[PDB]
């Protein structure tokens, strides 16, 4: 009610029914440069956050930096599937089996389990057949095959490749902290749905990982000499952008986003409503005030995915990233339909949040909340 | 100032999501006894308003002649799972009023029970009007429109006398002026009210209080008698109010007449508790009402919080509440059988 005392604690996405507030959801977001400097924020941009599957490009880097993995001949689409929370479409299952074959492993070697598909259409096909998904159907199956590959390549057991004491998980933990530029004690660890260790760290550092992806892609495309790590980051970016259907699937936000942007960015979902985007240097990033790549990370405090995709699409519009025509491929996510059982629209979504970082009285405190 | 009351989920002790909780616990006159969050938050009651809409139906002149029974009234109060038995009862109620499915003005939707919906998907079933979770309410409004000789084609429109009756009855049960109730449109295409959350608790306290007064042989107005009947119908036929496995059904079965409870979509909940040792211990001499809203709309968190609140209020025994253990602490087990996290209730009741 007072535009001059607005605060991070008031950064919301709200749904209404005939103008009456239905639900409200707190938003947190960080927009960072290629070194992690914070450029813009919503909510608490340093919120300690479970990255969930948005950490997968970092886990893929740990796989690709494992000595001997290159000999298996994983291609870009295989790397994309390592980075994926796929919809368990037949092509994802088939590629998982092909990756198994490249390392001479079997489905029984996987330590992830089946689950209902992340795609409603795939799940409808499974329901019709009373199909029970198995390990090879896991949305994380590509990451698991990559972890198996790394365990085999260094001569570790494949037994227990998913456990924290295994050297593959030691490599993951170190790689995540290094990409975030954190000490190990500033990264916390739980266990994911796919039964791997999964990291939590300040939300802005998830943005920093993705800014580093995009920055590495810029350096590779420009022909700059790169470290082995930067070359591997550039390869991960390229793989995701070239095979975005491996990263998610038909009708999925990550796939539709990356297809619409045609190489300009990569993006990835984390469960419980986190999202991360790495944006290559562009006219839009320069207008935001940086000379290199950019990273964006978002968390919806209560975990609602429909709201996450609406907010991410709104934030891209506010940041001037893309064109209206590019972002219009995402219109169904930006303003989710609210049509009742008789075809009547009953309400909608609104975005009463305010990006900070672009000028207010110096006496307005922005308390991260 | 409202407290900062949350339910919080974790993964290995690391915070995953948090959800703001609003709750009101009120006496039979609506006086606020305990609260979480903002107990007066303006809130869409959604289907938690259905007992008030059922009252408007039952008070309509001539509706008694159709011979609706207790299970029919329960289905008027329902957000049912569209099980075959709910559809069958909808058709039986249509027949009682000499109407047809084509007269309904609600539409089909995926079932509120995931198990039912999977069964529909396997069979390529397209739900129709008679499968609406609100089908019983719609048959009741048809019945009221026909009973007073109003048109049936537009019984769902705000300008129809049945909707005028509903709008008046809701404000009267809330003890609000008409202008203090706001109205939107529900999923089933009826007008749907919003009012302060504590007033939703007040409606359910009046249900339970009427059940107590009928049980006790008090001189009741026709309205209190009808409220008592609604309470009794819900408690006697809780499977009509929701369905197998649903929180409302399991809650009411566990309590065996001691309370009624009802879900509103987007995570509101209302309970009417008959006077008991537990209510007297809370400091009231009559019935009480409980209303809850999860700010972000998460249903799993709603049922966890409602069950936690019952435990904090002492309502029921530990043995009775243990039937709801699966809702109180939702399972957090991964695809390989490993427990990955849990739910916590850092909130504190304000008295
Ligand atoms: Cl919402
Ligand atoms: Cl949650
Ligand atoms: Zn995983
Ligand atoms: Zn309805």
Numbering used by the authors:
A (entry chain B): -4 to 353, 357 to 367
B (entry chain A): 2 to 352
What does the paper say about this structure?
The ReAV enzyme from Rhizobium etli, a representative of Class 3 L-asparaginases, is sequentially and structurally different from other known L-asparaginases. Asparaginases (EC 3.5.1.1) catalyze the hydrolysis of L-asparagine, generating L-aspartate and ammonia. ReAV is a homodimeric protein, with each subunit containing a highly specific zinc-binding site created by two cysteines, a lysine, and a water molecule. Two Ser-Lys tandems (Ser48-Lys51, Ser80-Lys263) are located in the close proximity of the metal binding site, with Ser48 hypothesized to be the catalytic nucleophile.
Mutating position 48 to alanine resulted in only minor atomic shifts and local conformational changes within the active site area, consistent in both protein chains. In the S48A mutant, the zinc cation is only partially present at the metal binding site, with a refined occupancy of 0.7, as is the water molecule from the zinc coordination sphere. The loss of Ser48 from the Ser48-Lys51 tandem affects the conformational state of Lys51. The major rotamer of Lys51 (refined occupancy 0.7) retains its typical position where it forms H-bonds to the Oγ atom of Ser80, the carbonyl O atom of Ala79, and the Oδ atom of Asn134. The minor conformer, however, points in the opposite direction, forming an H-bond with a water molecule. The Oγ atom of Ser80 no longer interacts with the Ser48 hydroxyl; instead, this interaction is compensated by an H-bond to an additional water molecule, which likely mimics a water molecule of the triad. A negatively charged sulfate ion, derived from the crystallization solution, appears in the close vicinity of the metal binding site, forming H-bonds to the Nη atom of Arg47 and the main-chain N atoms of Gly188 and Cys189. Notably, the side chain of Asp187 adopts two conformations: one in which its Oδ atoms interact with the Oγ atom of Thr193 and the Nε atom of Arg47, and another in which the side chain is oriented toward the metal coordination sphere. The role of the primary nucleophile of ReAV has been recently assigned to Ser48. In agreement with this postulate, substitution of Ser48 with alanine rendered the mutant protein inactive, as the L-asparaginase reaction could not be initiated.
